[PDB]
Chain A
Amino acid sequence: LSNERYQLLSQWPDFTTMYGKDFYYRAHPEDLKKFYDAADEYYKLYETVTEFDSLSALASQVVPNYAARRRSTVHPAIGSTVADGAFTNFLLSKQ
């Protein structure tokens, strides 16, 4: 999934082609501060999508709730559809 986010950070337009002083002084001061904020934001997003040592601790938050859902009093592989079919077999047979 981080690969699919990094693929759309690979499609980001190059803002370091507009770092010269030709684009500094032709441009509105507020739009230039916005452009520099947009470059700072891309550096934040790219520093945090390539922190791959954090995925191994992100995966430990999906693990306990899933393992407690499998630690069932009926069956590890039970679900709603099998329980519904067994409820018809229990209900539509006699008593």
Chain B
Amino acid sequence: DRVLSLPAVSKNQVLENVFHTAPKAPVEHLEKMVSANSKVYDALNLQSKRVLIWQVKPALF
């Protein structure tokens, strides 16, 4: 019964109770907010190719 003096918590259980969640990378915030502020740039700049300012306040020719 040598096995009953070893720690009963396996190395698997340590590795799954210590690294429980896959941690958030810091570049995920950058790439997500950049891919959404590209849409903020596209709609709302006055130099984008697809501005909303002519679909919203049309013109007066």
Per the CB 8 Å criterion, the residue count for chain A at the interface is 18
Is chain B's binding surface mostly helix, strand, loop or mixed? helix
State the main secondary structure of chain A at its contact with B. Answer: helix
Min CB distance B2 to A, Å, is: 33
Closest A residue to B29 using CB positions: A16
Q: How far does the alpha carbon of A53 sit from the alpha carbon of B50 in the complex, in Å?
A: 9
User: A16 contacts B43, CB within 8 Å?
Assistant: no
Residues of chain A lying within 8 A (CB to CB) of residue B37: 50
A19 to chain B: which residues have CB within 8 Å? 23-24, 26, 29
Instruction: Establish whether residues B36 and A21, one from each chain, have CB atoms under 8 Å apart when the complex forms.
Output: no
Q: B21, B24, B33, B44 — which one has the most chain A CB atoms within 10 A of its CB?
A: B24
Instruction: Determine if B47 is an interface residue (Cβ-Cβ < 8 Å).
Output: no
